Amino acid sequence: MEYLIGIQGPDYVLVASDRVAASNIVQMKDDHDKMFKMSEKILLLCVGEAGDTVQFAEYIQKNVQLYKMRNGYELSPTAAANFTRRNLADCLRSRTPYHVNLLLAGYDEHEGPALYYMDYLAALAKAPFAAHGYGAFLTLSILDRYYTPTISRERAVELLRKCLEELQKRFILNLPTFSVRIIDKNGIHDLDNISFP
Amino acid sequence: TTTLAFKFRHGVIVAADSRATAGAYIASQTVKKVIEINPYLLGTMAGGAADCSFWERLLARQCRIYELRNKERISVAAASKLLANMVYQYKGMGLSMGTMICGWDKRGPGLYYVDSEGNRISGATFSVGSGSVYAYGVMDRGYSYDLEVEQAYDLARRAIYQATYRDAYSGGAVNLYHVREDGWIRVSSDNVADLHEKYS
Amino acid sequence: MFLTRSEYDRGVNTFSPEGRLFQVEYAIEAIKLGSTAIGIQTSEGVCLAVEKRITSPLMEPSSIEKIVEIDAHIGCAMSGLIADAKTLIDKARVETQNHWFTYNETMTVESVTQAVSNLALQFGEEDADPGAMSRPFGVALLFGGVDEKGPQLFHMDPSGTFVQCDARAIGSASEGAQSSLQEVYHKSMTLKEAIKSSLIILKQVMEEKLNATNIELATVQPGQNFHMFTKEELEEVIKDI
Amino acid sequence: RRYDSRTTIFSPEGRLYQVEYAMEAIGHAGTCLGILANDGVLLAAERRNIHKLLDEVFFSEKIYKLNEDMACSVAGITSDANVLTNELRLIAQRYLLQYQEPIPCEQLVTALCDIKQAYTQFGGKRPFGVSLLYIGWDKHYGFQLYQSDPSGNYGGWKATCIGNNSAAAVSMLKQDYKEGEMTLKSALALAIKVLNKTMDVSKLSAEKVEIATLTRENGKTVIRVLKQKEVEQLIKKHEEEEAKAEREK
Amino acid sequence: RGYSFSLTTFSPSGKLVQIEYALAAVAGGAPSVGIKAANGVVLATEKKQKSILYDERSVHKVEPITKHIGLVYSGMGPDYRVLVHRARKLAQQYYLVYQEPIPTAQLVQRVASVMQEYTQSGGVRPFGVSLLICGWNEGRPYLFQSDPSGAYFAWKATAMGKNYVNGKTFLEKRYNEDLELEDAIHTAILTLKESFEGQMTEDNIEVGICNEAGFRRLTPTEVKDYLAA
Amino acid sequence: FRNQYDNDVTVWSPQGRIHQIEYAMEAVKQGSATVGLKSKTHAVLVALKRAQSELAAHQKKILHVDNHIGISIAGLTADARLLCNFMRQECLDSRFVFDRPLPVSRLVSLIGSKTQIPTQRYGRRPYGVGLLIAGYDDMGPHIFQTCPSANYFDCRAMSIGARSQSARTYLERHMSEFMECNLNELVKHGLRALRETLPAEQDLTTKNVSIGIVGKDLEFTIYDDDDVSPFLEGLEERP
Amino acid sequence: SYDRAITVFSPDGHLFQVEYAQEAVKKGSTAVGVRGRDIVVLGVEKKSVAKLQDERTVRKICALDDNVCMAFAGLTADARIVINRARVECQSHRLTVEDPVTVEYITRYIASLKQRYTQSNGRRPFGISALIVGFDFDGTPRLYQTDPSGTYHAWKANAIGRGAKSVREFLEKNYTDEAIETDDLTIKLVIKALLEVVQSGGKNIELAVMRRDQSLKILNPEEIEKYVAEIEKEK
Amino acid sequence: TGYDLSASTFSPDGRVFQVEYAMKAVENSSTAIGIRCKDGVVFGVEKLVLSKLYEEGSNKRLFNVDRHVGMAVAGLLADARSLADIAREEASNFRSNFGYNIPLKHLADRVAMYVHAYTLYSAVRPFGCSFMLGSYSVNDGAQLYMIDPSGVSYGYWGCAIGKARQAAKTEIEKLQMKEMTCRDIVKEVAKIIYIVHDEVKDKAFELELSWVGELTNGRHEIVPKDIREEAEKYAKESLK
Amino acid sequence: RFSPYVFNGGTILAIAGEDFAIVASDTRLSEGFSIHTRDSPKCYKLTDKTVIGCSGFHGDCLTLTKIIEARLKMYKHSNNKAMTTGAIAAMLSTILYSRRFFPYYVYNIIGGLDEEGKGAVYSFDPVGSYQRDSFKAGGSASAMLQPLLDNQVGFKNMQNVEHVPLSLDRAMRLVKDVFISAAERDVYTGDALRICIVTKEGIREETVSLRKD
């Protein structure tokens, strides 16, 4: 029911998510932020069953920031991905499985940009582009169609706009506004919200 | 039930009905569904009355302990997060709560919505209960951040009135509160019959 | 002729000959190291006062907290170990709020004092819980609050014994301060007279000349809640003296 | 009278004498040495056991490999050393399981030092009577040498020695070590020099020392123990150089 | 002083003196000799009995932990049996986990870890026994010693017990790496012959050997045949 | 010397005496005196309270466990409070489970077991408090005493605390009349008995006396400073 | 007699092992803290390089969180444990109440930990005293001190460790509203105070600042050299 | 000599002296005797009256540990009451599990092992009580057992404990209990107790008696007061 | 298979007053279609100023009464005072919520005199949510009884009718009448009515006959 999309590039990773939090039918919030900055150059996008999303996101955020404070350097995106995957996978067997679907986006000085994908069963996969939610089924073909490994960031925001206006055209739920931000060597950069009135 | 809360320039207006039902039997038409957690922040109860009352009271004692220990009143965000964590610990065990923690802090007016499912969200307008869907239309069409205090009271009263008109399990009287920067005040308790006399 | 063997004072849970249990007695001696505190109970209210004993000018005066609020109805003044005092104050606060939660009412000063006293008693280690300090609590508390019975002042000691007292002094100059209390005190005195007399006694015992900085003063009256005299109010009264 | 017992009593003047007595124990131990170079880092130790009827079955008596990217040499009680090395290996592999990256050197040292501090503080257990040197390469800070003591206190050293005649070793290293100019060969020669100075035996036997080097080749760390022929060549070269320096005068 | 009695107390000059006392307990134990031949390793010890009434078959000082591992001791008899049971159990745990016979080095590591585990706690005493653990793994012989301290060493040949220093000197004089076990058993009985203070017989000594076949305790008739020389 | 054998409860002495238990039994002597006596229809507890200072209130020496049982303490107030909590919970448990008042004899048996456990084990000290337990049950009025040693007795009358031998001898010489007394006569006898313990200068007052009465028709009630004046007025004077 | 166990009180009611731990704190390297109007400066002396040691491993000043930092004088390992425990408590408090820690909250937690170790035998007190600095939500500067006993007190400015008496006497003399007026003046005040007790000026002081809404900055050795040069010249 | 301080310790000559020191505890106690005859077992105790204030039928040293067995104690009364609680628990557990009344030999063995547990460990002292147990069952017969503080247990045709053990034992020895019957044995028990009582040292005593046997249908019970008075009058007459 | 509850029937009523409170209940216990007993009053005297009435599963009613009595004794011991009606109400709320997940199947009504001297009635759902009410009926016949109380006592839906404070006599008449009607048209409620009236004097118990089935 909630849409996440991520596009990796040569020197960046672009991420966007819908801004809707909802009750049964009422759309309680129009400006919900599903993006959590674990560190300066890594973001965690989370969608899933309510409560589990915020609880797990906050737990991983605070653990990563504790790593920062203790050791003086930030975790790698790959290491953060493996860590949150471990936490999610351990809970899967337990009586309190966090039903959460995540997308982790990061930039490493040594290893460059990275986008990571994990499902509620806690599989992990690096990917060039990925999406979560029912809208992902509609929008993945857009990315698979027009994506290039050498895509520039202007082209990437254009591609993302195409992907989202497809949701506007066809997806049953109303996802009127989306948040967008880029990670690069400089760090997380907020971008203007792609808003379809 | 129907509970209503919105933020505007001069504070937060909290409104609620007073009907509690078991099955279709109206056990009480005078339930006080706006729980005065503290002199400075207050909450609402929708869903299970026992769950809401017990957990909001526990939040109240935690808030007073915090005030005594840290020499400062807890923020609405911290109170909401405490309650959210407490209810989330019991997720899947059948608690039913939907409640709006309301207060001022250093940030400004504070309105949050927390539910037994686990969501905690802050927003300009909220409504919780069976009559939420009916209250939302009137509140949304009438709401503006720049609103006179009397006009805010009026839209709150009318929203709860229409919600009681349409929804069977919400009724009784409309209890209304204004959260003001010094603290909360209880502005009115108008019965739905008198409100029907007025509006019609 | 000196017999100084003692050989039984060390280690709680040892009854010495004549059965005196000297560790607790040494703990009761310990509060005499603390700053003098003083309490007077009156019909108009109960007042509490204490000398802060500021070590250096750079230390912030507000940080020294030898009078505190258990709740609106009850406040405490302490002399002795600040740390275990903080522990007992925490116990008092949580017990007051538990009583509010369970019975929707305010505890009496006697009940709160008994609640903290029960915790103080646990040095005996009758309970099997690991998290109880083996040593007795090296602090004495003065509990002052207005209850259903009106203004009440209760004294608590390291033993955990507690009693109501019309006026009491704890700390270093408790000996002599109590004699001054005994001569000055009469049950009819108003809280203004009690404040003045307690500050006179504190001025007498205190080594440094009395000033608004080096004392802490508080009162809880039936209409009011627990109140601490501010710098200005302290200035007014210490000028009046 | 006695404020040196139970490792939990601060003596007057505020000293924990049990940990100091434990620090006394490492001085008896066989000397161990570590030197940091631009291209690599080495560990060299004196095999104090020189009994004739002993077999060199193991990888090394003193040198232990804790991870792909680091190693350690130990001076102190061998049993506590075995325990600490087992704990170190488990810590490293736990970090690799959690983060899927190699343990940082400083983090591993810090974890074991936290254990060693914990044994000081609580009453029943004795402090670990061990001091050990850590050598490793990490992506963040490159080649690193670390020392630890029974107290649980660690530091980073360009070069240091622990054990018997550690003061003499450090005095020799202070003058000899060239900051920013060492290579692994020069550091090996310096190690042979300081070991010859410290060790009572007139001639380093080449069975009375164990030398191991850590280097990064082809993007992968290699921890290698110099074989008896290699260390024989090293002592021969040092003897020749020292004699030629003698011959000139 | 107080350092003497406590086990968790480093003495001044940094000595855990109770462990040294346990090693002194080991030194009082009966002589035991271990010699690692090229094709085998022999473990030998004296089984001197207080009287003829003792039944030699009842108890053995040389015990097999596994098919290819066996060990002998000098020190306290009860402690020996506690750890021999624990060693057998550890080897079986290894076989359950890895389905391979445990290496001798690994077994000595584990039993030494146990021995170290005992020294740390004040409520317990160290094991007043040392062991010579011999094994044949990967077509190679092994001999090890494990002390009360929890430390272990690898010896080509060594002796424990009474007169262990003199026995070790006799061994280093007599030891040659090229020895076959047929000669090594002779050297071992000679090493013990230094220190009996009695006329050795088949009963008074117990000896065992390891090889590609595995550990075995050669019978009284076998040791009689070897003693005849 | 024999400083050894006194350190802990777990050490027997060469003549079969556990000295720490005796040192605990010394504790009851430290406290202010208490007296208890019974008639066919009533059981009484009377106490001499002490005050730290003139301004301070007198300490609580009589405590109610249940309607049918109440206690008076001599020795450590801490141990008294703990044992009183245990007794109260036992009585509450009996009422919850069986819906009957707990027999007083059975309650003192429970106290004896709980008190005995410290004496034998290393660790917790003996309860250094002596209690007089008085109650009415179906069998009749009862008075018991419990020592810091877990042994307990059943008594026609008893006095514990400082200078209690004087009260005991008064009680013994006057005991025969107690059984047929009215409650007023009985409380007066007990008041005179504790008056024996007081210093000659000191005298009974409303303040320093507390009286505890239980009977067939009377639940345990502690008559406080104001309420003891009816009982005290009858007493004549010091002899 | 009465100095061998933490639990036992002495005659006259002195607990002496905690006093011995407070004495152990005095052995440690000096640290100084001062509250400027918009800055809090925390300065710590450096014992010595030893010429074969890497300075980065040894750092007395540490950041518990974005808005709080501490410096310590006392047992280094104990300080490391306490720092880690306070850091995890900081992140846990943010997790629990969705708000950043206040300086008084974290100093209360550290004091409670030290108190917990004092109360029970079988555990020795943490042989450290700490100087915790941070900016609260209102933006007021805060400086607190803790000791092995477990009492905590706010200080306008203070020192801990060896020479604390001398440097705090100097600071009682020197400190005033005028000195706190400038951030550079605050830094220069703490530098002069550490200069009161240290062998050499620039080499042997490690200094750091926290600004109103910025992270901790350890001043570069060149910056410290410039500041001591300005201080040296004015004399 | 620190050997006597603890029960974990051994003397260099192989003696655990704390247990002997605990055995000296019972000798402080007033005497108690139990005699076994054909019909059953009779118990008697010399309960010294410390004060007139103390109620009669108090400080009972004769306990009923089950319906078919009774217990008589000498030594510390607190430890004795606790041991009686232990014995009652053991008997109840035996009935609950094995479905019938506990054999006296087994009960003595279990309580003796419980007692013997304490002599080993250093944390806890030996018990300060020595007690006698007696029962009659038509199957087992009359049985009398005595347990010392050590945990030694044995069966006695006649037994004595406490201060006057030796004198009581010779007086019991010249009795021929095996042929005799219980209603005579009560009289002779009264005689022996009155003999061994020391009027000078001990001011007064109240004879406390009990028995178990066929006359009770195998239930331990306190003597009817008429029989008590008859035995006491006989004892006073014989004393001369 | 095993059902831990059974509805033992009965109804309870409580009606407050300016200076009095009344608590009244049936005295019938009925499992299924059979009558267990005809004399089992549902009203229990907690204190001089308070009465509790419980209806629902009788085992839960019994255990809750025992628990409340014990905790009343405990409060008396600790605080040296009797619990007020509000205090008992809050304590009961907490006790009921303690078993949120295996609840007490009881409908409770607390009726008493408050500290001020006025009558107060506190009404509880099975899971412990509680509210001060001027009057309420609980149990099987709540639906039947409470409307007439709302009309007569609350003067609801009545136009041009003066509001009079309720009197003791009028209240008792009303209670008897409503219980008679519930006896007529509710199968569970009948065969007696115990009226427990609390005043400054104390509890006074009157019994009036209701029709046997």
| SS3 sequence of chain B | CEEEEEEECCEEEEEECCCEEECCEEEECCCCCEECCCCCEEEECEECHHHHHHHHHHHHHHHHHHHHHHCCCCCHHHHHHHHHHHHHHCCCCCCCEEECCEEECCCCEEEEEEECCCCEEECCEEEEECCHHHHHHHHHHHCCCCCCHHHHHHHHHHHHHHHHHHCCCCCCEEEEEEECCCCEEEEEEEEHHHHHHHHC
Q: Work out whether the CA dihedral E174, E176, E182, E185 comes out positive or negative.
A: positive
Q: What CATH number does residue E132 fall under?
A: 3.60.20.10
Residues 6+ apart with CB under 8 A from C96: C70, C71, C74, C106, C107, C112
User: How many angstroms separate the most distant Cα atoms in chain E?
Assistant: 53
**For chain H, what are the domain ranges?**
1-240
Neighbours of D246 (CB within 10 A): 8
Domain boundaries, position G105: 16-234
Chain breaks in chain A (C to N over 2.5 A) after: none
Token digits of residue F33: 């005196």
Q: What is the DSSP letter of I159?
A: -
Q: Which class would CATH give B1-200?
A: alpha beta
The contacts of residue F204 (CB under 8 Å, 6+ apart) are F191, F194, F195, F198, F232, F235
Return d(Cα F157, Cα F147) in angstroms, integer.
15
Look at the block and give the residue holding tokens 């935690």. B62
* Nearest Cα to Cα of residue A65 among D96, G87, G217, G83: G87
Q: CA-CA-CA-CA torsion for A18, A23, A27, A31, nearest 10 degrees?
A: -50
Letter for the amino acid at E217?
R
> CA distances (Å), I93 to each of B42, B87, B193, H79, I24, in order?
20, 19, 32, 46, 21
Q: Does C107 touch chain I (CB under 8 A)?
A: yes
Alpha-carbon span A126 to G222, nearest angstrom: 44
Phi, psi angles (nearest 5°) of residue G143? -135, 130
Domain count, chain I: 1
C16, part of any domain? no
Per-residue CA distances from I2 to E104, I99, I101, I103 (Å): 61, 19, 17, 16
Is B159 annotated to bind ligand?
Answer: no
Q: At what angle do helices D78-99 and D105-121 cross, to 10 degrees?
A: 130
Helices and strands counted in chain G (H then E): 6, 11
Nearest by CB to B106, which of G96, G97, G137? G137
Element housing C170 (H / E): strand C167-170
Chain I neighbours among C 138-157 (CB < 8 Å)?
A: 148
Q: Which helix (H) or strand (E) holds H223?
A: none
Whether residue A140 contacts residue A112, with contact meaning beta carbons closer than 8 Å, is answered with no
Reading the block at residue F85, the tokens are 């909590």
- Indicate yes or no: CB of D97 within 8 angstroms of CB of A86: yes
Asked if I176 contacts I182 with a C-beta cutoff of 8 angstroms, the reply is no
**F-chain residues near I66 (CB < 8 A):** 96
Partner B contacted by A23 (CB < 8 A) = yes
State the burial class of residue E39 (Cβ atoms within 10 Å of its Cβ: 0-12, 13-18, 19+).
middle
How many domains in chain E? 1
Q: What are phi and psi of C222, to 5 degrees?
A: -60, -45
Q: Which residue segment(s) compose the domain that F234 sits in?
A: 1-239
Structure-token match 């530091």, residue found: D155
Task: Taking the CA atoms of E133, E136, E137 and E143 in sequence, report the sign of the dihedral they define.
Answer: positive
Among candidate residues E68, E41, E73, E45, the one with its CA nearest the CA of residue E147: E73
Measured CA to CA, the distance from residue G38 to residue G163 in angstroms comes to 27
G131 vs G146: CA distance, rounded Å = 7
Q: Subunits with at least 3 CB pairs below 8 A relative to chain F?
A: C, H, I
Q: What is the resolution of this structure in A?
A: 3.2
SS3 D43: strand
Cα gap F104→F137, rounded to integer Å: 7
Helix (H, G, I), strand (E, B) or coil at I88: helix
First CA to last CA across chain I, in angstroms?
31
Method used experimentally: cryo-EM
Q: Does residue C115 belong to any structural domain of this protein?
A: yes
I78 alpha carbon, distance to own chain's centre:
28
C106 in a structural domain? yes
Domain assignment of residue C182, yes or no = yes
Q: Say if C41 falls within a structural domain.
A: yes
Nearest partner of H223 among H34, H84, H43, judged by Cα: H43
Residues with Cβ < 8 Å from F167, sequence gap 6 or more?
F33, F35, F159, F193, F194, F196, F197
Whether C98 sits inside 8 A of B61 (CB atoms) is yes
CA-based nearest distance B151→chain G, Å: 34
Phi and psi at C45, nearest 5°, equal 165, -170
Q: Indicate whether G5 belongs to any domain.
A: no
Query: What are the phi and psi torsion angles at I40 (to 5°)?
Result: -145, 80
C-alpha of G65 from chain center: 15
Q: What whole-number distance in Å separates Cα of residue D135 and Cα of residue H77?
A: 70
Helix (H, G, I), strand (E, B) or coil at H107: helix
CA–CA gap between residue B83 and residue B121 (Å, rounded): 12
Q: Is residue D8 part of a domain?
A: no
Task: Report the alpha-carbon distance of residue D151 to residue D117 in Å, rounded.
Answer: 6
Tell how strand G40-45 and strand C150-156 pair up: unpaired
Residue in B69, B75, B85 closest to G99 by CB: B75
On whether the CB atoms of residues F81 and C118 are closer than 8 A, the answer is yes
Domains in chain F, number: 1
Q: Looking at CA atoms only, how far is residue D175 from chain E in angstroms?
A: 30
Q: Across the interface, do D124 and E122 touch by the CB < 8 Å criterion?
A: yes
Q: In the numeric block, which tokens belong to residue C229? A: 């005299």
Domain that holds residue E168: 2-228
| DSSP H or E stretch at residue F66 | none
Rounded Cα distance between D199 and D197, Å, is 6
The answer to whether residue D7 is domain-embedded is: no
Q: What is the DSSP code (8-state) at residue I99?
A: T
Inter-residue contact I191 to I27 (CB < 8 Å): yes
What is the extent of the structural domain holding I104? 1-213
Shortest CB distance from B61 goes to which of C69, C70, C100? C100
User: Which burial class, exposed, middle or buried, applies to B115 when counting CB atoms under 10 A from its CB (0-12, 13-18, 19+)?
Assistant: buried
F83 alpha carbon, distance to own chain's centre: 12
Looking at CA atoms only, how far is residue D143 from chain G in angstroms?
A: 12
Return left, alpha or beta for G33; rule: phi > 0 is left, psi -120 to 50 is alpha, else beta. beta
d(CA C61, CA C45): 26
Determine, yes or no, domain membership for D172: yes
Q: What is the 3-state secondary structure (H, E, C) of A17-62?
A: EECCECCCCCCCECCCCCEEEEECCEEEEEEECCCHHHHHHHHHHH
Q: B interface mutation test: which of A28, A29, A56 has the most B CBs within 10 A?
A: A28
Contact status, residue C83 vs residue C66, Cβ threshold 8 Å: no
Tell me which residue has tokens 């028990």: H189
Beta bridge partners of I35: I30
Domain count, chain G: 1
Residue-range definition of the domain harbouring residue D237? 17-248
Cα separation, E181 vs E190, in Å, equals 14
Option in G96, G105, G138 nearest B70 (CB): G105
Which residue range forms the structural domain that includes residue C128? 22-240
User: Is residue H34 a contact partner of residue H159, using CB atoms and an 8 Å limit?
Assistant: yes
Query: How do strand G152-154 and strand I43-47 relate by DSSP bridges?
Result: unpaired
List all chains that touch chain G, counting a touch as 3 or more CB pairs closer than 8 Å: A, B, C, D
CATH number of the domain bearing residue G89: 3.60.20.10
What is the number of helices (H) and of strands (E) in chain D? Answer: 6, 10
Distance, in angstroms, between B72 CA and closest chain I CA?
A: 28
Closest CA to G185 of G46, G30, G41: G41
What's the CATH number where I75 sits?
A: 3.60.20.10
- Least CA distance to H5: which residue of chain F? F11
**G33 shares contact with chain D (CB less than 8 Å):** no
Token readout for B72 is 């400062």
Residues in chain B with CB shorter than 8 Å from the CB of I86 are none
